Amino acid sequence: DKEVGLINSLELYTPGEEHDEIRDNDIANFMIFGKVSDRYIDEVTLNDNMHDKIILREEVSKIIEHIETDNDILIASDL
Amino acid sequence: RFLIANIFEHKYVVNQLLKVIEHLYVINKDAKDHRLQTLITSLLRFSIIEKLLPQRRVEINYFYEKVKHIIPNLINDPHFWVQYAMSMIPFKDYPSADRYLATAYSLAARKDNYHTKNIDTQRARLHLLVSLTKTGNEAYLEFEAGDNLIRIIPNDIYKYRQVLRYRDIYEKVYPTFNAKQKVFYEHAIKRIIKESESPELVEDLTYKIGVNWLDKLRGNLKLIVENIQENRPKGKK
């Protein structure tokens, strides 16, 4: 008896399959009201010259390097 | 619909649906009430499940593979296998749906006086889909396999649903065929047009509800026929 079952308390993140156009409306919504679809996030991570739509933080590369070497990660910040 | 799709999470919807269907199956073996049977046999259909769980493949697959263990009688019921097969049609898993429809056919074969018109309709829909995905001689073979089945299918409400796919066939896969296959589906669409104008539809209330859109479909078929005749060479007109 083996059975994979379902995962109930966790959701599986899945990447993008389509290119969504970004307007000034989505930029304004994200920067002011904090509303952003995950397709926007998946789009601004393919191209690293895409500096007019998100601030790229070098903490992400450090965290990726740390997670590839079988380490856990704990992030803390202010409001 | 917004509450179901956005407040009630899908990981609650599938589990609660399994719980309520097991409960409804358990209590019905004493009361034998017809409304409970209708509710149970309606909770199975993929239209309702796709209305409850919008485009969730994993949840639908888990639900359909668990429900056949919830009740031990669906494996002997062809209709469950038809619902399973039609569950995976928009998910382009064509060979597995073919196996499911074959199992449904085998289950229907051992039942006396059991009509297979719905199963034949789904098989013809699978034929049309795999003919859309294919080109050339294989597309013609699948198209003929769809045509004979839709010919033995009587003129009912579900038959007119498959008419729209011939328009896409003429729009996309038409130039890939040779002249013989062109004449083949040319007389096929002429026969379909002739069957569409039969007075059996006019006396039906289901056609009476939607007269405008069936008339528009008939006009579209006539325009397709006219375009076929216009694109014909001058030596065959």
PDB file of C-alpha atoms in Angstrom:
ATOM      1  CA  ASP A   1       0.000   0.000   0.000  1.00  0.00           C
ATOM      2  CA  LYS A   2       1.492   3.273  -1.242  1.00  0.00           C
ATOM      3  CA  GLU A   3      -0.557   6.390  -1.956  1.00  0.00           C
ATOM      4  CA  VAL A   4       0.613   9.961  -2.499  1.00  0.00           C
ATOM      5  CA  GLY A   5      -2.614  11.596  -1.337  1.00  0.00           C
ATOM      6  CA  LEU A   6      -3.259  15.324  -1.305  1.00  0.00           C
ATOM      7  CA  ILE A   7      -1.376  18.127   0.425  1.00  0.00           C
ATOM      8  CA  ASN A   8      -3.888  20.123   2.453  1.00  0.00           C
ATOM      9  CA  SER A   9      -2.118  22.768   4.567  1.00  0.00           C
ATOM     10  CA  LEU A  10       0.419  23.723   1.877  1.00  0.00           C
ATOM     11  CA  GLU A  11       0.000  24.955  -1.663  1.00  0.00           C
ATOM     12  CA  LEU A  12       2.348  24.195  -4.524  1.00  0.00           C
ATOM     13  CA  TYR A  13       3.686  27.314  -6.209  1.00  0.00           C
ATOM     14  CA  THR A  14       3.781  26.957  -9.989  1.00  0.00           C
ATOM     15  CA  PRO A  15       5.695  29.270 -12.350  1.00  0.00           C
ATOM     16  CA  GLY A  16       4.397  31.224 -15.324  1.00  0.00           C
ATOM     17  CA  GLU A  17       3.458  29.883 -18.749  1.00  0.00           C
ATOM     18  CA  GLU A  18       2.370  33.115 -20.473  1.00  0.00           C
ATOM     19  CA  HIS A  19       3.720  36.639 -20.875  1.00  0.00           C
ATOM     20  CA  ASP A  20       1.367  39.228 -19.375  1.00  0.00           C
ATOM     21  CA  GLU A  21       1.729  42.804 -20.575  1.00  0.00           C
ATOM     22  CA  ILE A  22       2.395  45.368 -17.873  1.00  0.00           C
ATOM     23  CA  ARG A  23       0.828  48.804 -18.039  1.00  0.00           C
ATOM     24  CA  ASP A  24       1.229  51.885 -15.902  1.00  0.00           C
ATOM     25  CA  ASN A  25      -1.899  50.700 -14.068  1.00  0.00           C
ATOM     26  CA  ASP A  26      -0.288  47.521 -12.734  1.00  0.00           C
ATOM     27  CA  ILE A  27       2.855  49.450 -11.783  1.00  0.00           C
ATOM     28  CA  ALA A  28       0.858  52.089  -9.901  1.00  0.00           C
ATOM     29  CA  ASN A  29      -1.285  49.466  -8.160  1.00  0.00           C
ATOM     30  CA  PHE A  30       1.755  47.465  -7.044  1.00  0.00           C
ATOM     31  CA  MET A  31       3.771  50.447  -5.857  1.00  0.00           C
ATOM     32  CA  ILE A  32       0.997  52.313  -4.027  1.00  0.00           C
ATOM     33  CA  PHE A  33      -1.750  49.901  -2.997  1.00  0.00           C
ATOM     34  CA  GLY A  34       0.403  46.762  -2.858  1.00  0.00           C
ATOM     35  CA  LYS A  35      -1.705  44.717  -5.288  1.00  0.00           C
ATOM     36  CA  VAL A  36       0.268  42.411  -7.581  1.00  0.00           C
ATOM     37  CA  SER A  37      -0.566  39.185  -9.374  1.00  0.00           C
ATOM     38  CA  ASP A  38       2.032  36.427  -9.242  1.00  0.00           C
ATOM     39  CA  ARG A  39       2.321  36.545 -13.038  1.00  0.00           C
ATOM     40  CA  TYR A  40       3.858  40.015 -12.669  1.00  0.00           C
ATOM     41  CA  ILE A  41       6.438  38.580 -10.249  1.00  0.00           C
ATOM     42  CA  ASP A  42       7.234  35.674 -12.579  1.00  0.00           C
ATOM     43  CA  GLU A  43       7.617  38.122 -15.473  1.00  0.00           C
ATOM     44  CA  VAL A  44      10.015  40.530 -13.766  1.00  0.00           C
ATOM     45  CA  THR A  45      12.394  37.688 -12.863  1.00  0.00           C
ATOM     46  CA  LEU A  46      13.215  36.469 -16.387  1.00  0.00           C
ATOM     47  CA  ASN A  47      14.969  39.676 -17.493  1.00  0.00           C
ATOM     48  CA  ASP A  48      17.452  41.442 -15.219  1.00  0.00           C
ATOM     49  CA  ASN A  49      17.516  44.642 -17.308  1.00  0.00           C
ATOM     50  CA  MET A  50      13.867  45.244 -16.378  1.00  0.00           C
ATOM     51  CA  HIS A  51      14.718  47.939 -13.852  1.00  0.00           C
ATOM     52  CA  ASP A  52      11.652  50.144 -14.398  1.00  0.00           C
ATOM     53  CA  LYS A  53       9.219  47.730 -12.737  1.00  0.00           C
ATOM     54  CA  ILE A  54      10.862  46.280  -9.591  1.00  0.00           C
ATOM     55  CA  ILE A  55      13.864  46.977  -7.370  1.00  0.00           C
ATOM     56  CA  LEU A  56      16.288  44.050  -7.574  1.00  0.00           C
ATOM     57  CA  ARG A  57      17.859  43.220  -4.213  1.00  0.00           C
ATOM     58  CA  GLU A  58      21.175  41.383  -3.959  1.00  0.00           C
ATOM     59  CA  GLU A  59      19.963  39.698  -0.769  1.00  0.00           C
ATOM     60  CA  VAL A  60      18.086  37.265  -3.033  1.00  0.00           C
ATOM     61  CA  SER A  61      21.304  35.952  -4.610  1.00  0.00           C
ATOM     62  CA  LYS A  62      22.901  35.476  -1.180  1.00  0.00           C
ATOM     63  CA  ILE A  63      19.813  33.638   0.059  1.00  0.00           C
ATOM     64  CA  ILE A  64      19.817  31.421  -3.053  1.00  0.00           C
ATOM     65  CA  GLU A  65      23.493  30.572  -2.534  1.00  0.00           C
ATOM     66  CA  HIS A  66      22.773  29.733   1.107  1.00  0.00           C
ATOM     67  CA  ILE A  67      19.739  27.572   0.289  1.00  0.00           C
ATOM     68  CA  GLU A  68      21.633  25.578  -2.359  1.00  0.00           C
ATOM     69  CA  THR A  69      24.157  24.437   0.292  1.00  0.00           C
ATOM     70  CA  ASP A  70      21.614  22.657   2.565  1.00  0.00           C
ATOM     71  CA  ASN A  71      21.160  25.592   4.959  1.00  0.00           C
ATOM     72  CA  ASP A  72      18.004  27.000   6.498  1.00  0.00           C
ATOM     73  CA  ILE A  73      17.120  30.685   6.270  1.00  0.00           C
ATOM     74  CA  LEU A  74      15.485  33.075   8.744  1.00  0.00           C
ATOM     75  CA  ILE A  75      14.516  36.605   7.661  1.00  0.00           C
ATOM     76  CA  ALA A  76      13.636  39.477   9.992  1.00  0.00           C
ATOM     77  CA  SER A  77      12.782  43.106   9.282  1.00  0.00           C
ATOM     78  CA  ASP A  78      10.790  46.124  10.441  1.00  0.00           C
ATOM     79  CA  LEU A  79       7.245  47.177   9.466  1.00  0.00           C
TER      80      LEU A  79
ATOM     81  CA  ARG B   1     -19.672  31.654  -7.673  1.00  0.00           C
ATOM     82  CA  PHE B   2     -17.250  34.226  -6.247  1.00  0.00           C
ATOM     83  CA  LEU B   3     -17.748  32.838  -2.727  1.00  0.00           C
ATOM     84  CA  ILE B   4     -17.062  29.276  -3.900  1.00  0.00           C
ATOM     85  CA  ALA B   5     -14.037  30.245  -5.982  1.00  0.00           C
ATOM     86  CA  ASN B   6     -12.415  32.715  -3.598  1.00  0.00           C
ATOM     87  CA  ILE B   7     -13.580  32.355   0.023  1.00  0.00           C
ATOM     88  CA  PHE B   8     -14.013  28.580   0.217  1.00  0.00           C
ATOM     89  CA  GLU B   9     -10.554  27.335  -0.734  1.00  0.00           C
ATOM     90  CA  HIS B  10     -10.319  24.381  -3.117  1.00  0.00           C
ATOM     91  CA  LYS B  11      -8.515  22.274  -0.503  1.00  0.00           C
ATOM     92  CA  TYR B  12     -11.667  22.604   1.589  1.00  0.00           C
ATOM     93  CA  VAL B  13     -14.045  22.121  -1.349  1.00  0.00           C
ATOM     94  CA  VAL B  14     -12.731  18.710  -2.407  1.00  0.00           C
ATOM     95  CA  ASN B  15     -12.573  17.303   1.140  1.00  0.00           C
ATOM     96  CA  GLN B  16     -16.046  18.574   2.038  1.00  0.00           C
ATOM     97  CA  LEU B  17     -17.437  17.201  -1.224  1.00  0.00           C
ATOM     98  CA  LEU B  18     -16.019  13.764  -0.438  1.00  0.00           C
ATOM     99  CA  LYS B  19     -17.445  13.924   3.090  1.00  0.00           C
ATOM    100  CA  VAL B  20     -20.932  14.915   1.938  1.00  0.00           C
ATOM    101  CA  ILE B  21     -20.997  12.334  -0.864  1.00  0.00           C
ATOM    102  CA  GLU B  22     -19.949   9.552   1.529  1.00  0.00           C
ATOM    103  CA  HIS B  23     -22.625  10.685   3.989  1.00  0.00           C
ATOM    104  CA  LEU B  24     -25.303  10.818   1.273  1.00  0.00           C
ATOM    105  CA  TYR B  25     -24.343   7.350   0.055  1.00  0.00           C
ATOM    106  CA  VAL B  26     -24.447   5.979   3.613  1.00  0.00           C
ATOM    107  CA  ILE B  27     -27.853   7.311   4.634  1.00  0.00           C
ATOM    108  CA  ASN B  28     -29.593   6.469   1.348  1.00  0.00           C
ATOM    109  CA  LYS B  29     -29.408   2.684   1.808  1.00  0.00           C
ATOM    110  CA  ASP B  30     -32.209   2.898   4.415  1.00  0.00           C
ATOM    111  CA  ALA B  31     -34.475   5.713   3.192  1.00  0.00           C
ATOM    112  CA  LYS B  32     -34.106   4.911  -0.546  1.00  0.00           C
ATOM    113  CA  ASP B  33     -35.365   8.402  -1.357  1.00  0.00           C
ATOM    114  CA  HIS B  34     -35.191   9.459  -5.003  1.00  0.00           C
ATOM    115  CA  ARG B  35     -33.912  12.978  -4.276  1.00  0.00           C
ATOM    116  CA  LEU B  36     -30.849  11.524  -2.542  1.00  0.00           C
ATOM    117  CA  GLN B  37     -30.166   9.304  -5.562  1.00  0.00           C
ATOM    118  CA  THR B  38     -30.517  12.270  -7.925  1.00  0.00           C
ATOM    119  CA  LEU B  39     -28.192  14.362  -5.742  1.00  0.00           C
ATOM    120  CA  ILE B  40     -25.578  11.592  -5.654  1.00  0.00           C
ATOM    121  CA  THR B  41     -25.746  10.939  -9.403  1.00  0.00           C
ATOM    122  CA  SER B  42     -25.610  14.693 -10.087  1.00  0.00           C
ATOM    123  CA  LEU B  43     -22.626  15.372  -7.815  1.00  0.00           C
ATOM    124  CA  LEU B  44     -20.603  13.067 -10.084  1.00  0.00           C
ATOM    125  CA  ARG B  45     -20.985  14.980 -13.345  1.00  0.00           C
ATOM    126  CA  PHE B  46     -17.992  16.974 -14.542  1.00  0.00           C
ATOM    127  CA  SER B  47     -20.062  20.077 -15.305  1.00  0.00           C
ATOM    128  CA  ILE B  48     -20.848  20.501 -11.605  1.00  0.00           C
ATOM    129  CA  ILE B  49     -17.297  19.675 -10.474  1.00  0.00           C
ATOM    130  CA  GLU B  50     -15.774  22.117 -12.952  1.00  0.00           C
ATOM    131  CA  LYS B  51     -18.264  24.693 -11.689  1.00  0.00           C
ATOM    132  CA  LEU B  52     -17.075  23.989  -8.122  1.00  0.00           C
ATOM    133  CA  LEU B  53     -13.302  23.614  -8.709  1.00  0.00           C
ATOM    134  CA  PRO B  54     -12.251  25.966 -11.541  1.00  0.00           C
ATOM    135  CA  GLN B  55      -9.265  24.581 -13.521  1.00  0.00           C
ATOM    136  CA  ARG B  56      -7.741  22.451 -10.763  1.00  0.00           C
ATOM    137  CA  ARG B  57      -6.277  19.278 -12.271  1.00  0.00           C
ATOM    138  CA  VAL B  58      -4.864  17.676  -9.153  1.00  0.00           C
ATOM    139  CA  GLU B  59      -8.027  18.117  -7.091  1.00  0.00           C
ATOM    140  CA  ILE B  60     -10.291  16.781  -9.853  1.00  0.00           C
ATOM    141  CA  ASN B  61      -8.038  13.765 -10.449  1.00  0.00           C
ATOM    142  CA  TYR B  62      -7.871  12.971  -6.727  1.00  0.00           C
ATOM    143  CA  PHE B  63     -11.645  13.334  -6.391  1.00  0.00           C
ATOM    144  CA  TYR B  64     -12.371  11.033  -9.312  1.00  0.00           C
ATOM    145  CA  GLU B  65      -9.834   8.405  -8.234  1.00  0.00           C
ATOM    146  CA  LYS B  66     -11.128   8.452  -4.647  1.00  0.00           C
ATOM    147  CA  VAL B  67     -14.861   8.387  -5.396  1.00  0.00           C
ATOM    148  CA  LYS B  68     -14.590   4.950  -7.049  1.00  0.00           C
ATOM    149  CA  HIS B  69     -13.306   3.654  -3.707  1.00  0.00           C
ATOM    150  CA  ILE B  70     -15.963   5.620  -1.800  1.00  0.00           C
ATOM    151  CA  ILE B  71     -18.683   3.575  -3.530  1.00  0.00           C
ATOM    152  CA  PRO B  72     -17.717   0.143  -4.941  1.00  0.00           C
ATOM    153  CA  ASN B  73     -20.306   0.287  -7.747  1.00  0.00           C
ATOM    154  CA  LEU B  74     -18.963   2.987 -10.096  1.00  0.00           C
ATOM    155  CA  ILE B  75     -16.360   0.650 -11.601  1.00  0.00           C
ATOM    156  CA  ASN B  76     -19.285  -1.415 -12.907  1.00  0.00           C
ATOM    157  CA  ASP B  77     -21.157   1.742 -13.980  1.00  0.00           C
ATOM    158  CA  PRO B  78     -20.188   2.993 -17.471  1.00  0.00           C
ATOM    159  CA  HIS B  79     -21.414   6.529 -16.727  1.00  0.00           C
ATOM    160  CA  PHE B  80     -18.683   7.125 -14.145  1.00  0.00           C
ATOM    161  CA  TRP B  81     -16.082   6.194 -16.743  1.00  0.00           C
ATOM    162  CA  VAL B  82     -17.692   8.565 -19.257  1.00  0.00           C
ATOM    163  CA  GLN B  83     -17.480  11.346 -16.657  1.00  0.00           C
ATOM    164  CA  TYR B  84     -13.857  10.489 -15.960  1.00  0.00           C
ATOM    165  CA  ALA B  85     -13.046  10.511 -19.668  1.00  0.00           C
ATOM    166  CA  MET B  86     -14.720  13.880 -20.207  1.00  0.00           C
ATOM    167  CA  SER B  87     -12.897  15.213 -17.135  1.00  0.00           C
ATOM    168  CA  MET B  88      -9.549  15.071 -18.957  1.00  0.00           C
ATOM    169  CA  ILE B  89     -10.597  16.353 -22.405  1.00  0.00           C
ATOM    170  CA  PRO B  90      -9.683  20.043 -21.789  1.00  0.00           C
ATOM    171  CA  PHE B  91      -6.462  18.810 -20.134  1.00  0.00           C
ATOM    172  CA  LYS B  92      -5.185  17.266 -23.445  1.00  0.00           C
ATOM    173  CA  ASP B  93      -4.618  13.807 -21.921  1.00  0.00           C
ATOM    174  CA  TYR B  94      -6.076  12.075 -24.959  1.00  0.00           C
ATOM    175  CA  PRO B  95      -4.712   8.472 -24.687  1.00  0.00           C
ATOM    176  CA  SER B  96      -5.767   8.081 -21.050  1.00  0.00           C
ATOM    177  CA  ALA B  97      -9.249   9.351 -21.909  1.00  0.00           C
ATOM    178  CA  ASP B  98      -9.225   6.836 -24.768  1.00  0.00           C
ATOM    179  CA  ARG B  99      -8.496   4.040 -22.285  1.00  0.00           C
ATOM    180  CA  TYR B 100     -11.284   5.293 -20.010  1.00  0.00           C
ATOM    181  CA  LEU B 101     -13.764   5.406 -22.894  1.00  0.00           C
ATOM    182  CA  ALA B 102     -12.692   1.909 -23.964  1.00  0.00           C
ATOM    183  CA  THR B 103     -13.367   0.660 -20.429  1.00  0.00           C
ATOM    184  CA  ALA B 104     -16.751   2.402 -20.560  1.00  0.00           C
ATOM    185  CA  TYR B 105     -17.454   0.652 -23.877  1.00  0.00           C
ATOM    186  CA  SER B 106     -16.498  -2.708 -22.363  1.00  0.00           C
ATOM    187  CA  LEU B 107     -18.767  -2.078 -19.371  1.00  0.00           C
ATOM    188  CA  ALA B 108     -21.622  -1.060 -21.679  1.00  0.00           C
ATOM    189  CA  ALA B 109     -21.130  -4.178 -23.816  1.00  0.00           C
ATOM    190  CA  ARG B 110     -22.002  -6.514 -20.927  1.00  0.00           C
ATOM    191  CA  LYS B 111     -25.231  -4.603 -20.119  1.00  0.00           C
ATOM    192  CA  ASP B 112     -28.396  -5.545 -21.946  1.00  0.00           C
ATOM    193  CA  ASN B 113     -30.454  -2.873 -23.691  1.00  0.00           C
ATOM    194  CA  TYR B 114     -28.006  -0.173 -22.554  1.00  0.00           C
ATOM    195  CA  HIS B 115     -27.756   2.693 -25.029  1.00  0.00           C
ATOM    196  CA  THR B 116     -24.241   3.953 -25.784  1.00  0.00           C
ATOM    197  CA  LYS B 117     -25.203   7.184 -27.569  1.00  0.00           C
ATOM    198  CA  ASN B 118     -23.563   9.415 -24.950  1.00  0.00           C
ATOM    199  CA  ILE B 119     -20.432   7.243 -24.945  1.00  0.00           C
ATOM    200  CA  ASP B 120     -20.421   7.347 -28.750  1.00  0.00           C
ATOM    201  CA  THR B 121     -20.789  11.139 -28.611  1.00  0.00           C
ATOM    202  CA  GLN B 122     -17.762  11.423 -26.331  1.00  0.00           C
ATOM    203  CA  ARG B 123     -15.813   9.012 -28.552  1.00  0.00           C
ATOM    204  CA  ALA B 124     -16.640  11.168 -31.584  1.00  0.00           C
ATOM    205  CA  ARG B 125     -15.572  14.265 -29.637  1.00  0.00           C
ATOM    206  CA  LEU B 126     -12.249  12.548 -28.924  1.00  0.00           C
ATOM    207  CA  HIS B 127     -11.990  11.704 -32.637  1.00  0.00           C
ATOM    208  CA  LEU B 128     -12.572  15.353 -33.550  1.00  0.00           C
ATOM    209  CA  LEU B 129      -9.973  16.503 -31.013  1.00  0.00           C
ATOM    210  CA  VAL B 130      -7.293  14.074 -32.202  1.00  0.00           C
ATOM    211  CA  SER B 131      -8.115  15.031 -35.799  1.00  0.00           C
ATOM    212  CA  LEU B 132      -7.563  18.667 -34.822  1.00  0.00           C
ATOM    213  CA  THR B 133      -4.198  17.717 -33.318  1.00  0.00           C
ATOM    214  CA  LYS B 134      -3.193  15.668 -36.387  1.00  0.00           C
ATOM    215  CA  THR B 135      -2.699  16.439 -40.072  1.00  0.00           C
ATOM    216  CA  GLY B 136      -2.791  14.383 -43.247  1.00  0.00           C
ATOM    217  CA  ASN B 137      -3.948  10.786 -43.617  1.00  0.00           C
ATOM    218  CA  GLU B 138      -4.222  10.149 -39.867  1.00  0.00           C
ATOM    219  CA  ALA B 139      -6.435  13.228 -39.522  1.00  0.00           C
ATOM    220  CA  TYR B 140      -8.648  11.891 -42.321  1.00  0.00           C
ATOM    221  CA  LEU B 141      -8.841   8.476 -40.630  1.00  0.00           C
ATOM    222  CA  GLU B 142      -9.883  10.014 -37.310  1.00  0.00           C
ATOM    223  CA  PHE B 143     -12.322  12.294 -39.149  1.00  0.00           C
ATOM    224  CA  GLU B 144     -13.961   9.273 -40.797  1.00  0.00           C
ATOM    225  CA  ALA B 145     -14.062   7.498 -37.425  1.00  0.00           C
ATOM    226  CA  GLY B 146     -15.906  10.542 -36.104  1.00  0.00           C
ATOM    227  CA  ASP B 147     -18.181  10.749 -39.140  1.00  0.00           C
ATOM    228  CA  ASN B 148     -19.478   7.176 -39.004  1.00  0.00           C
ATOM    229  CA  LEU B 149     -20.151   7.443 -35.262  1.00  0.00           C
ATOM    230  CA  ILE B 150     -21.970  10.766 -35.664  1.00  0.00           C
ATOM    231  CA  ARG B 151     -23.923   9.180 -38.527  1.00  0.00           C
ATOM    232  CA  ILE B 152     -25.154   6.360 -36.283  1.00  0.00           C
ATOM    233  CA  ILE B 153     -25.859   8.968 -33.582  1.00  0.00           C
ATOM    234  CA  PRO B 154     -29.500  10.126 -33.818  1.00  0.00           C
ATOM    235  CA  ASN B 155     -30.280  13.821 -34.164  1.00  0.00           C
ATOM    236  CA  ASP B 156     -30.337  14.958 -30.528  1.00  0.00           C
ATOM    237  CA  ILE B 157     -29.276  18.029 -28.557  1.00  0.00           C
ATOM    238  CA  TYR B 158     -25.708  16.800 -28.002  1.00  0.00           C
ATOM    239  CA  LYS B 159     -25.168  16.105 -31.717  1.00  0.00           C
ATOM    240  CA  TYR B 160     -25.303  19.786 -32.691  1.00  0.00           C
ATOM    241  CA  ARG B 161     -22.447  20.603 -30.296  1.00  0.00           C
ATOM    242  CA  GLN B 162     -19.958  18.790 -32.509  1.00  0.00           C
ATOM    243  CA  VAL B 163     -20.909  20.842 -35.589  1.00  0.00           C
ATOM    244  CA  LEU B 164     -18.755  23.805 -34.503  1.00  0.00           C
ATOM    245  CA  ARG B 165     -15.549  21.747 -34.749  1.00  0.00           C
ATOM    246  CA  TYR B 166     -15.971  21.189 -38.500  1.00  0.00           C
ATOM    247  CA  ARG B 167     -15.648  24.960 -38.946  1.00  0.00           C
ATOM    248  CA  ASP B 168     -12.255  24.886 -37.213  1.00  0.00           C
ATOM    249  CA  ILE B 169     -11.360  21.807 -39.282  1.00  0.00           C
ATOM    250  CA  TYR B 170     -12.057  23.766 -42.470  1.00  0.00           C
ATOM    251  CA  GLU B 171     -10.211  26.793 -41.076  1.00  0.00           C
ATOM    252  CA  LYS B 172      -7.018  24.977 -40.028  1.00  0.00           C
ATOM    253  CA  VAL B 173      -6.562  21.415 -41.324  1.00  0.00           C
ATOM    254  CA  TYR B 174      -8.406  21.733 -44.665  1.00  0.00           C
ATOM    255  CA  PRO B 175      -5.349  22.424 -46.927  1.00  0.00           C
ATOM    256  CA  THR B 176      -3.460  19.425 -45.494  1.00  0.00           C
ATOM    257  CA  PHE B 177      -5.886  16.969 -47.110  1.00  0.00           C
ATOM    258  CA  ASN B 178      -5.879  15.746 -50.701  1.00  0.00           C
ATOM    259  CA  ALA B 179      -8.674  16.095 -53.257  1.00  0.00           C
ATOM    260  CA  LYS B 180     -10.341  12.781 -52.360  1.00  0.00           C
ATOM    261  CA  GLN B 181     -10.595  13.707 -48.677  1.00  0.00           C
ATOM    262  CA  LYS B 182     -11.789  17.177 -49.707  1.00  0.00           C
ATOM    263  CA  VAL B 183     -14.668  15.609 -51.655  1.00  0.00           C
ATOM    264  CA  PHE B 184     -15.200  13.239 -48.702  1.00  0.00           C
ATOM    265  CA  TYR B 185     -15.878  15.903 -46.091  1.00  0.00           C
ATOM    266  CA  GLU B 186     -17.541  17.978 -48.790  1.00  0.00           C
ATOM    267  CA  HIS B 187     -20.316  15.393 -49.149  1.00  0.00           C
ATOM    268  CA  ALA B 188     -20.165  14.854 -45.378  1.00  0.00           C
ATOM    269  CA  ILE B 189     -20.922  18.525 -44.678  1.00  0.00           C
ATOM    270  CA  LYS B 190     -23.618  18.460 -47.373  1.00  0.00           C
ATOM    271  CA  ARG B 191     -25.212  15.507 -45.557  1.00  0.00           C
ATOM    272  CA  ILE B 192     -24.894  17.361 -42.238  1.00  0.00           C
ATOM    273  CA  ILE B 193     -26.583  20.425 -43.763  1.00  0.00           C
ATOM    274  CA  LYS B 194     -29.384  18.244 -45.165  1.00  0.00           C
ATOM    275  CA  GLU B 195     -29.874  16.611 -41.755  1.00  0.00           C
ATOM    276  CA  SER B 196     -29.937  20.059 -40.113  1.00  0.00           C
ATOM    277  CA  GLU B 197     -32.956  21.215 -42.151  1.00  0.00           C
ATOM    278  CA  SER B 198     -35.058  18.169 -41.229  1.00  0.00           C
ATOM    279  CA  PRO B 199     -38.426  19.070 -39.631  1.00  0.00           C
ATOM    280  CA  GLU B 200     -37.717  16.895 -36.569  1.00  0.00           C
ATOM    281  CA  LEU B 201     -35.807  19.780 -34.967  1.00  0.00           C
ATOM    282  CA  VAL B 202     -38.612  22.303 -35.540  1.00  0.00           C
ATOM    283  CA  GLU B 203     -41.125  20.344 -33.452  1.00  0.00           C
ATOM    284  CA  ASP B 204     -38.612  20.104 -30.579  1.00  0.00           C
ATOM    285  CA  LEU B 205     -38.770  22.719 -27.831  1.00  0.00           C
ATOM    286  CA  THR B 206     -34.999  22.570 -27.260  1.00  0.00           C
ATOM    287  CA  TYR B 207     -34.393  23.845 -30.790  1.00  0.00           C
ATOM    288  CA  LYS B 208     -37.276  26.299 -30.298  1.00  0.00           C
ATOM    289  CA  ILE B 209     -35.419  27.925 -27.387  1.00  0.00           C
ATOM    290  CA  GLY B 210     -32.322  28.617 -29.484  1.00  0.00           C
ATOM    291  CA  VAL B 211     -33.644  29.067 -33.036  1.00  0.00           C
ATOM    292  CA  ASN B 212     -31.345  32.030 -33.736  1.00  0.00           C
ATOM    293  CA  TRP B 213     -28.035  30.326 -32.966  1.00  0.00           C
ATOM    294  CA  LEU B 214     -28.812  27.054 -34.774  1.00  0.00           C
ATOM    295  CA  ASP B 215     -29.931  29.167 -37.742  1.00  0.00           C
ATOM    296  CA  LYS B 216     -26.642  31.083 -37.544  1.00  0.00           C
ATOM    297  CA  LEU B 217     -24.751  27.774 -37.438  1.00  0.00           C
ATOM    298  CA  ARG B 218     -26.668  26.561 -40.504  1.00  0.00           C
ATOM    299  CA  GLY B 219     -25.823  29.804 -42.292  1.00  0.00           C
ATOM    300  CA  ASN B 220     -22.173  29.355 -41.325  1.00  0.00           C
ATOM    301  CA  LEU B 221     -22.210  25.841 -42.800  1.00  0.00           C
ATOM    302  CA  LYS B 222     -23.815  27.221 -45.968  1.00  0.00           C
ATOM    303  CA  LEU B 223     -21.114  29.906 -46.174  1.00  0.00           C
ATOM    304  CA  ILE B 224     -18.462  27.200 -45.724  1.00  0.00           C
ATOM    305  CA  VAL B 225     -20.053  25.252 -48.594  1.00  0.00           C
ATOM    306  CA  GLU B 226     -20.108  28.413 -50.727  1.00  0.00           C
ATOM    307  CA  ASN B 227     -16.430  29.065 -49.955  1.00  0.00           C
ATOM    308  CA  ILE B 228     -15.619  25.454 -50.889  1.00  0.00           C
ATOM    309  CA  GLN B 229     -17.400  25.911 -54.222  1.00  0.00           C
ATOM    310  CA  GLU B 230     -15.668  29.263 -54.803  1.00  0.00           C
ATOM    311  CA  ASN B 231     -12.228  27.781 -54.079  1.00  0.00           C
ATOM    312  CA  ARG B 232     -12.931  24.906 -56.478  1.00  0.00           C
ATOM    313  CA  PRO B 233     -10.962  24.947 -59.753  1.00  0.00           C
ATOM    314  CA  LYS B 234     -12.644  26.263 -62.883  1.00  0.00           C
ATOM    315  CA  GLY B 235     -12.391  22.821 -64.501  1.00  0.00           C
ATOM    316  CA  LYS B 236     -14.627  21.243 -61.848  1.00  0.00           C
ATOM    317  CA  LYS B 237     -17.240  23.971 -61.259  1.00  0.00           C
TER     318      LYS B 237
END
